[PDB]
Amino acid sequence: ERQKVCLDIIYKMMPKLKPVELRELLNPVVEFVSHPSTTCREQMYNILMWIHDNYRDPESETDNDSQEIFKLAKDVLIQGLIDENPGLQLIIRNFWSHETRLPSNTLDRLLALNSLYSPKI
């Protein structure tokens, strides 16, 4: 219960934090891929779905933590496709299977499909 409530507060206090400290708080969040009690793992896959969407940073190229935690939130949003609880992964499939995150010309999709490899899967 402590680890559900302490994730529900950190989902609330994201859009005020500077990236000097979100990198510090993101190091123990993304260790929750080896956790039972599927509701807390749902919370952990729900805050990264915002981190990746609001730290996409379309070619600003001024900071390095803002392009490092996008890497570290790619590296768990990929590994959350083999989770041992079906029904939950359909959410992540509908997430990755949408336009502006993977195109719909099918040759663009075949070219893009090598980017999301990540040899954990």
mmCIF file of C-alpha atoms in Angstrom:
data_model
loop_
_atom_site.group_PDB
_atom_site.id
_atom_site.type_symbol
_atom_site.label_atom_id
_atom_site.label_comp_id
_atom_site.label_asym_id
_atom_site.label_seq_id
_atom_site.Cartn_x
_atom_site.Cartn_y
_atom_site.Cartn_z
ATOM 1 C CA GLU A 1 0.000 0.000 0.000
ATOM 2 C CA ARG A 2 2.944 2.310 0.672
ATOM 3 C CA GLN A 3 4.215 1.629 -2.818
ATOM 4 C CA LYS A 4 0.889 2.359 -4.403
ATOM 5 C CA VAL A 5 0.424 5.655 -2.563
ATOM 6 C CA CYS A 6 4.016 6.831 -3.059
ATOM 7 C CA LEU A 7 3.608 6.352 -6.788
ATOM 8 C CA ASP A 8 0.276 8.118 -6.831
ATOM 9 C CA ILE A 9 1.895 11.166 -5.273
ATOM 10 C CA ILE A 10 4.729 11.148 -7.809
ATOM 11 C CA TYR A 11 2.214 10.994 -10.632
ATOM 12 C CA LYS A 12 0.755 14.182 -9.139
ATOM 13 C CA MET A 13 3.987 16.118 -8.636
ATOM 14 C CA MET A 14 5.477 15.692 -12.113
ATOM 15 C CA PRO A 15 4.532 18.921 -14.035
ATOM 16 C CA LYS A 16 6.408 21.270 -11.718
ATOM 17 C CA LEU A 17 9.758 19.481 -11.410
ATOM 18 C CA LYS A 18 12.839 20.658 -13.240
ATOM 19 C CA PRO A 19 14.826 17.972 -15.109
ATOM 20 C CA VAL A 20 17.721 18.255 -12.643
ATOM 21 C CA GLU A 21 15.685 16.220 -10.134
ATOM 22 C CA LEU A 22 13.276 14.170 -12.257
ATOM 23 C CA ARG A 23 16.383 12.221 -13.266
ATOM 24 C CA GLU A 24 16.950 11.478 -9.595
ATOM 25 C CA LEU A 25 13.377 10.372 -8.962
ATOM 26 C CA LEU A 26 13.222 8.299 -12.170
ATOM 27 C CA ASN A 27 15.995 5.960 -11.060
ATOM 28 C CA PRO A 28 13.893 4.002 -8.480
ATOM 29 C CA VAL A 29 10.593 4.258 -10.374
ATOM 30 C CA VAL A 30 11.775 2.206 -13.349
ATOM 31 C CA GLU A 31 13.024 -0.577 -11.101
ATOM 32 C CA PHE A 32 9.365 -1.596 -10.699
ATOM 33 C CA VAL A 33 9.266 -3.872 -13.749
ATOM 34 C CA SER A 34 10.134 -6.874 -11.555
ATOM 35 C CA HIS A 35 7.226 -6.331 -9.181
ATOM 36 C CA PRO A 36 4.022 -8.268 -8.497
ATOM 37 C CA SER A 37 0.738 -6.570 -7.467
ATOM 38 C CA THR A 38 -0.266 -5.411 -10.951
ATOM 39 C CA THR A 39 -1.975 -2.170 -9.875
ATOM 40 C CA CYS A 40 1.338 -0.607 -8.813
ATOM 41 C CA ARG A 41 2.971 -1.753 -12.040
ATOM 42 C CA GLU A 42 0.049 -0.143 -13.856
ATOM 43 C CA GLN A 43 0.857 3.127 -12.084
ATOM 44 C CA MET A 44 4.519 2.790 -13.049
ATOM 45 C CA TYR A 45 3.565 2.257 -16.681
ATOM 46 C CA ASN A 46 1.181 5.215 -16.428
ATOM 47 C CA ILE A 47 3.646 7.890 -15.370
ATOM 48 C CA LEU A 48 6.118 6.972 -18.138
ATOM 49 C CA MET A 49 3.357 7.348 -20.726
ATOM 50 C CA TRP A 50 3.372 11.031 -19.759
ATOM 51 C CA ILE A 51 7.163 11.370 -19.429
ATOM 52 C CA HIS A 52 7.687 10.147 -22.986
ATOM 53 C CA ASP A 53 4.915 12.374 -24.314
ATOM 54 C CA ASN A 54 6.071 15.604 -22.647
ATOM 55 C CA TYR A 55 9.845 15.092 -22.840
ATOM 56 C CA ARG A 56 9.873 14.225 -26.552
ATOM 57 C CA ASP A 57 11.586 17.628 -27.082
ATOM 58 C CA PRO A 58 11.371 18.161 -30.868
ATOM 59 C CA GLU A 59 14.962 19.319 -31.500
ATOM 60 C CA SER A 60 15.668 21.842 -28.771
ATOM 61 C CA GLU A 61 19.137 20.351 -28.071
ATOM 62 C CA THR A 62 20.131 22.542 -25.137
ATOM 63 C CA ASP A 63 20.191 20.144 -22.167
ATOM 64 C CA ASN A 64 21.500 16.609 -21.663
ATOM 65 C CA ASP A 65 19.295 15.280 -18.848
ATOM 66 C CA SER A 66 16.224 16.130 -20.920
ATOM 67 C CA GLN A 67 17.557 13.775 -23.596
ATOM 68 C CA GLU A 68 18.851 11.167 -21.138
ATOM 69 C CA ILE A 69 15.650 10.521 -19.203
ATOM 70 C CA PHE A 70 13.853 10.199 -22.530
ATOM 71 C CA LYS A 71 16.278 7.346 -23.208
ATOM 72 C CA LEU A 72 15.634 5.801 -19.795
ATOM 73 C CA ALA A 73 11.861 6.075 -20.366
ATOM 74 C CA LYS A 74 12.244 4.466 -23.756
ATOM 75 C CA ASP A 75 14.104 1.586 -22.106
ATOM 76 C CA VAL A 76 11.159 0.502 -19.902
ATOM 77 C CA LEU A 77 8.343 1.385 -22.274
ATOM 78 C CA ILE A 78 9.959 -1.140 -24.592
ATOM 79 C CA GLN A 79 10.485 -3.868 -21.952
ATOM 80 C CA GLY A 80 6.829 -3.534 -20.956
ATOM 81 C CA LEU A 81 5.643 -5.688 -23.811
ATOM 82 C CA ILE A 82 6.374 -9.094 -22.225
ATOM 83 C CA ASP A 83 4.830 -8.544 -18.799
ATOM 84 C CA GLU A 84 3.382 -11.626 -17.129
ATOM 85 C CA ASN A 85 -0.178 -10.241 -16.888
ATOM 86 C CA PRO A 86 -2.271 -10.049 -20.080
ATOM 87 C CA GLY A 87 -4.935 -7.390 -20.324
ATOM 88 C CA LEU A 88 -2.384 -4.901 -19.034
ATOM 89 C CA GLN A 89 -0.180 -5.141 -22.115
ATOM 90 C CA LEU A 90 -3.107 -4.396 -24.438
ATOM 91 C CA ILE A 91 -2.979 -0.846 -23.054
ATOM 92 C CA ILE A 92 0.673 -0.523 -24.069
ATOM 93 C CA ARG A 93 -0.059 -2.064 -27.472
ATOM 94 C CA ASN A 94 -2.809 0.483 -28.125
ATOM 95 C CA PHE A 95 -0.353 3.150 -26.940
ATOM 96 C CA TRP A 96 2.470 2.181 -29.315
ATOM 97 C CA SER A 97 0.039 1.459 -32.188
ATOM 98 C CA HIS A 98 -1.121 5.066 -32.701
ATOM 99 C CA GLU A 99 -0.156 7.779 -35.161
ATOM 100 C CA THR A 100 2.702 10.265 -34.400
ATOM 101 C CA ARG A 101 4.400 7.488 -32.415
ATOM 102 C CA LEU A 102 4.484 4.982 -35.332
ATOM 103 C CA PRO A 103 3.348 6.018 -38.844
ATOM 104 C CA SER A 104 0.744 4.423 -41.115
ATOM 105 C CA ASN A 105 2.325 4.240 -44.574
ATOM 106 C CA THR A 106 3.678 0.706 -43.691
ATOM 107 C CA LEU A 107 7.026 1.332 -45.330
ATOM 108 C CA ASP A 108 7.582 4.141 -42.874
ATOM 109 C CA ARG A 109 6.427 1.682 -40.210
ATOM 110 C CA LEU A 110 8.799 -1.034 -41.426
ATOM 111 C CA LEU A 111 11.630 1.489 -41.390
ATOM 112 C CA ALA A 112 10.667 2.727 -37.923
ATOM 113 C CA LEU A 113 10.323 -0.760 -36.435
ATOM 114 C CA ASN A 114 14.075 -1.148 -35.926
ATOM 115 C CA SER A 115 14.239 1.769 -33.486
ATOM 116 C CA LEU A 116 12.183 0.015 -30.822
ATOM 117 C CA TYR A 117 14.357 -3.092 -30.601
ATOM 118 C CA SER A 118 16.057 -3.009 -27.131
ATOM 119 C CA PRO A 119 17.662 -6.474 -26.606
ATOM 120 C CA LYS A 120 15.886 -7.025 -23.288
ATOM 121 C CA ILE A 121 13.226 -8.312 -25.700
#
